[PDB]
Paper text:
The arginine biosynthesis pathway consists of eight different enzymes ([Fig fig1]) all considered to be essential for *M. tuberculosis* growth *in vitro*. In this work, the ligandability of four enzymes of the pathway ArgB, ArgC, ArgD and ArgF is explored using a fragment-based approach.
(A) X-ray crystal structure of ArgC apoenzyme superposed with the NAPD bound holoenzyme. Binding of NAPD causes significant structural changes in two loops of the protein that move from a closed to open conformation ([Fig fig2]). The apoenzyme ArgC with 5% DMSO was found to have a melting temperature of 67.7 °C. While 1 mM NADP^+^ gave a small average positive thermal shift of ~0.6 °C and 1 mM NADPH produced an average negative thermal shift of −0.9 °C across all DSF runs performed.
Author numbering:
A (entry chain B), B (entry chain A), C (entry chain A), D (entry chain B): 9 to 352
The structure:
């Protein structure tokens, strides 16, 4: 069987990975085993003190996050979306399947990495967004997966079919609202319930957010032109969900743009192109690995508009990780991953 | 094979029954098939216009709620929690498994029914709360199920073990907070988002809420003493969840009360007795069919305190319906029903 | 002395006008008196049944919305943001100060009106956004006020200074999140608490939202260039608030753009330019008549970014109405209107 | 003029005190001056970095919380609801007006204090709940005010008129829901937005919550009998508000109970007894100093039911502090304190 460890098990991404593994058919039939669950602090505590929703695992004792603890597993999830896991990954075998939820292996330009993260570039691993052109090929049987950021997932699914078909200009604007679990479980005044409830705020604006070059990198991969990205994230009083509104100038008719999205996504199990007249809502995808997408043309403004809704913790993080895990191990890509949201 | 219809498919309960059926192992292996989906209005619309989270069924055309449309189905969910379905159930073929989410077949006292509902009592069907003493045996192979109300589910699970052991006085007090989906999908000013967000309110207080006699009935089934129930429901700004705080005067040691909960729930997969020092939270059970329960004694006030958390749409409605359906059809009781919540 | 009537008193805008009037210094000293409160339904009910927060007026009996009831008032608020009040305004005595919260008198182009609203253009009244160039002078002593829409208020405050200085291109993009009270108090499934809580959705996208031409009109007033507007509104799980993210292509230094904002807003008491390194939040302006604004430049994307936060019911509706009323009556513009939000 | 200092200015209670002082008529006419604003950490920061809603004070520099800094003021608010301010208060003159939002001077029984707080009893000051029998007398011209806890305020306003008239039994049950600002601004995993949003949980149950003896003390003051209190607090996804549901057995008719509440509250400016048929909602009192109260009798359960809604930060904390300040200084009790909530 495949023995899986989860480093960063007490955080939100780690808890969501474990929820999905508990429901995975390979866990049910014994082909997947949940092994070491580790954290940087609170080793010796039980998982129930961190994730009371995961009652089948409530008695598991959290262990320290160390290469020795993570060795001896066939697959290791590094469930630190805001952490830097290059040092730990360098201690693990190339034949161990490593799935990093953090950013350390996402970027392919060392100069861009140094500017936005202020450290030496660790390299790049196959990007865990199987729906991007060419990405599924790179993931099949890989032993290394860099899971995408949550905002780039929504923006790239909204924009890449139009840009790959050369139907929009390569200067794009993205304004995305997100629930607060995407900021992680570290306690901060600005993430307190009293602060977030009843309020919305943009943050890290005008190109300083580290997901900006990640969006640019994904879009540059489908075009020959210089790509520019205006990316604004907005925190809203929800625990989960990302609704990305993405725009770009266009000279193309809506019929041609719609056909490009139908062609890109008609056989993609997790991407749902809304019927004409319907628009995405994050409530409809919560708990699911689905992305709901709609496209339109603002004739007066000569502007293409694409809306994408995902669950930031599933298709934006842990669901992408499990989906890519399935591809890496040769299991059905959809195993353990529902398209049905938990609404209302 | 069992072909299932859902009447009132466009409401919250009907949408949640459909979510559970889509994830049910008998659906995946072909033994359970989803047939007619009906509503009293909007016949001719598609299901995706009502329940965008249910994308596998998005193209289904909603049909009128009529006996003729519901014929040819082995099981019919009357997913009208606030409706009166005695007239429609009388029109179906009597061999159908009829599962009523509403109240018409819950109560066993005709004078109590007439006082609270203003009509002639129709009778009673096996009560779909399998964990109550004697209930599971009435559900095995039944062709009739009366799904419990959502508040009585939480209150009865919280209180019945202590009362059955005669360890608390039979005058109980229940104050239960509920998310707003329990009030149904009918549009009213008082249920609008702007009104509910940022606000809490008790309603139908001092014994006028129709779940008061339902709680009393379930408790009277476990004791010979005269039972009284003070029940206050409180709407809070959440979409789902019920947290019931239940009290009664006691002079019994806490250890004896805990022993009663252990005897009732040690072999019940959907009831989780919290570890010492932990308390339930509705966010830990959302999406699951579980009830998380904790008990304590206030020695200064000589008061027993029981806290129960459920998802009002799962263990309080649709999950109870599906759990009881499994018993009716001879399928594993837990099929299609998870104990793991979708948190945060 | 000014006796004021409020037509549509039972809606959200009417309730907020009444809250501001009750706190207005002219109400406390006797110069402003609150007269008839009317609605199209529920005549004969009391105001407390509709607006329990307005306890000083709880005993007032709601009257029918009819010209005869509205006679004898020096000022009449037509507090119907989603209504068409041209017919009723024609029935009032022409010397009345008429303050329309709806759209009928906002637009200045008859062909644009007919395209977006499907009817004959009625004309235009002085636009109740005193901070726009030229607007305050049209409001002094007016007997007619067209209150701006809530989204245009935020977008115009965010963008007009940069465009007036010719420092950004005239093709602007606006993505604005809004709490649900902006959609009005009419009960619809899509506005129910269970639906809105935990969810975000864009709506009326790609130029079909009727505030698109209103934003374009306000911007065309400050430039000779051809203006285009891509406007996307997004409903989020809050009762109040609008956060507008506004963008346009620029090659101008940030210091010059900041100078334009300083020139426009240095003497405007309701406009707060954030200190360097701070960004607006809708929770900081709730209950106040203030707009908090920040600007920045994304040099990599050659994009200007302006963020504006307002309370949609105060500076976006009722506070704009009262601010303009003060100008109409010759009272201090700030009377009754606070710059301090109710946070958290 | 009266020079006022606020110790704990960067917390929620301190910010709310300052919001009320900014709107106080004595601040407008110069009779009240806002002096030193202090905090235990972050001295040297500006108030705008902690309370962006308080823009008139945004440039004030936070000073260290020291007796020397607080000396030289005529009145000092100790805005530490969860802190222990006896050591600081002992350094200030008996003629300085000290208003303590914390608990150190609330209790009149040293043995009860030691059991619940684990420290030596500091003494007792006049209790800042002017509506309690005899309390207004004690506050007039005092130089010392112990502001009540937020939950006791709601419970005592709900229960004292019935108990003082000997119309209910002295064993009471209180289940109160509260928004998260009552837990204070200290960053904690369990107070994170992602945790609190979409969830409810009881905490500190079965008599361990320190407000239990505070409720008992207030009730014992109006009766000759042994009082017992079962108090359960429940955290809900709101930033503000307390809805207390309070029950007790009774032999009295509703007409007699209603008359007792009409007599107690008919001349109380901040206490609104709901008209028959209406029930309190916390949304209707947010931002106001009002309490909305309803009473009823559950005939079948022989139980009196009282519901009270307050804003936990205003009538539950800072509004009580300002109301008591007015009484201490001989100013109109209602100065600076609205009864009109900010709804929706």
């Amino acid at each position: 069987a495949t023995k899986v460890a989860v480093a960063g098990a007490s955080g939100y991404a780690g808890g969501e990975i474990l929820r999905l593994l508990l429901g995975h058919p390979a866990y049910a039939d014994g082909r997947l085993r949940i092994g070491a669950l580790t954290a940087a602090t609170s080793a010796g505590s039980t998982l129930g003190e961190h994730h009371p929703h995961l009652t089948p695992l409530a008695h598991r004792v959290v262990e320290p996050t160390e290469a020795a603890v993570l060795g001896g597993h066939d697959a290791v999830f590094l469930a630190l979306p805001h952490g830097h896991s290059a040092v730990l990954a360098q201690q693990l075998s190339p034949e161990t399947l490593i799935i990093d939820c953090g950013a350390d292996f996402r970027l392919t330009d060392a100069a861009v990495w140094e500017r936005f993260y202020g450290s030496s570039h660790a390299g790049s691993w196959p990007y865990g967004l199987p729906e991007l052109p060419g990405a599924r090929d790179q993931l099949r049987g890989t032993r290394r997966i860099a899971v995408p950021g949550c905002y780039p997932t929504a923006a790239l699914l909204a924009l890449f079919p139009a840009l790959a078909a050369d139907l929009i200009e390569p200067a794009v604007t993205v304004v995305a609202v997100s629930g607060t679990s995407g900021a992680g479980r570290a306690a901060t005044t600005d993430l307190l319930g009293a602060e977030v409830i009843g309020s919305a705020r943009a943050y890290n604006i005008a190109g300083v957010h580290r997901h900006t070059p990640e969006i640019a990198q994904g879009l540059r991969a489908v075009t020959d032109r210089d790509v520019s990205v205006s990316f604004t994230p907005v925190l809203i009083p929800a625990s989960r969900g990302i609704l990305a509104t993405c725009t770009a100038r266009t000279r193309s008719p809506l019929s041609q743009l719609r056909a490009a999205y139908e062609k890109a996504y008609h056989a993609e199990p997790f991407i749902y192109l809304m019927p004409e007249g319907q628009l995405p809502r994050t409530g409809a995808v919560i708990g699911s690995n689905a992305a709901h997408i709609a496209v339109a043309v603002d004739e007066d403004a000569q502007t293409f508009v694409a809306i994408a809704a995902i669950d930031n913790l599933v298709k934006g993080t842990a669901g992408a990780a499990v989906q890519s895990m399935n591809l890496a191990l040769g299991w059905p890509e959809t195993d353990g991953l529902s398209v049905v949201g938990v609404a209302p």
